[PDB]
Design a protein around this ligand. Sequence first.
Ligand SMILES: OC[C@H]1O[C@H](O)[C@H](O)[C@@H](O)[C@@H]1O
Length: 392
Amino acid sequence: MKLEIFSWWAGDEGPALEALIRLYKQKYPGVEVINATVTGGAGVNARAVLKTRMLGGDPPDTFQVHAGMELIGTWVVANRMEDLSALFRQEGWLQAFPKGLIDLISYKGGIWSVPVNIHRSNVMWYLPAKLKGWGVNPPRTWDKFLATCQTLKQKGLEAPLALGENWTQQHLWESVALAVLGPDDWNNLWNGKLKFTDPKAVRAWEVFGRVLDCANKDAAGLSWQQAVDRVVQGKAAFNIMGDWAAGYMTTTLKLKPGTDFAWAPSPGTQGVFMMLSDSFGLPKGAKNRQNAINWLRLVGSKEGQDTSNPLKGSIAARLDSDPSKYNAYGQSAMRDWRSNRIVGSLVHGAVAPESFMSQFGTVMEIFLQTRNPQAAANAAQAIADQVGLGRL
Ligand SMILES: OC[C@H]1O[C@H](O)[C@H](O)[C@@H](O)[C@@H]1O
C-alpha cells in the first residue's frame, strides 16, 4: 500500500504538506506515503522532472499543478489525466468551490484537478518598524515606490527592493504589468486582444526597468526565501512575492503578522487580487489509483484545507473555510478574496500555457541584459505568436 505525491514543497515549504500527510496517514494507516518533492521555487525544476516521468510512462500517483492554463495546456490536452467529474459530484465540490475556480480546472466537458488553496501573487512585504526607523510610508503607487526608494538610497539603504532568481523577477514583473495595464488589459494579453508590442504593454517594461534599479545586484543567485530574508534583516525595505512568504515568516521564522511584518497590495494594484491555485489531479496509469483518489478527497475537504493552509500562508479554496483557523494575514487575504476584482497569475500558471510560461524566463533574461523595453516586448510577442497564445 503506497501513495507517491509529487510537488515542489521541499524544505521550509513542506510544513503544510507534511501536515496533510500526517492527516492522510491517520485515516489510512496501511499506506506508505512517498513525499516526492523536486526542490525549486515556483515549480520550474518540478515541471522538468515531471516531464521526464510523464513522457517516460512513469506518472506519480498525483502531482502539484496550477489551476488554469498550466494544467490544461500540458497534461490534459495530452490526454494523460483522468476526468474527475464523477468525484466532484460524489464530494459535492461543485458547490464547495467558487465558480471562477471551477472554470479554471474545467475543459471540454471534464474537470481535471482539485484545488487545495488560493495564493495571491501581488503582495508587497515590509517591516512596519523598519519603515518608521527610516521614516517612510508603504508605497501605494509605483511613482511613490520609486520616490521612496530614492529617499532610502539617500538614507543609506543601497538596495531598498529585495529580489531573487529569474522567476522572482518575472513575479515582480506581473505585479508591475497589472498596475500599468489595469485588470482588463492584463486579461487582454492572455486572450490575445492586447499585443505585447502595444505601447500600453511596452510601458510595463519601462516601469519594470526603473523598479529593477532599486533591487539588490546579487538577485540572480538568491531563492525567494533569501529575498524575503533581506527584508526581515533590514537589508531591504520591500519585496514583491506571493503569500507563501507569509507562511515562511510565521511558520518557519515565527514572526508575528502585523507587528513583526506587514503587507499591502503590490503598488498600483489595490483592489485586484492576482490569484493562483495549487491543485492535484489523477494521472492515467497511476500505480496507486485508489490511494490517490483518497488523497484528492482529503485535499478537497475542509479538514484538510484548514489544517494545511494556515501553515502555508495561502487561504483555502473551499468556500466554507473557517477564518478563526487563520492568523491576521490569512484573514486579510480571505477578506480581499471575496471583495476584490480577481485576475490570474502568469508566473503561477493561471493565464498562459507552459509553452509561453517556460519561454518568458528567456524574455526576462534578455530584458536584464538589454534593459530595452521594446526588445522585451517584441520578444514576448514573438513567443506568443510561436505558441499561438489564445488558441486554448
Ligand atoms: O515555490 C513558491 C510557490 O510557487 C508556486 O507557484 C506555488 O503555487 C506555491 O505553492 C509555492 O509556495
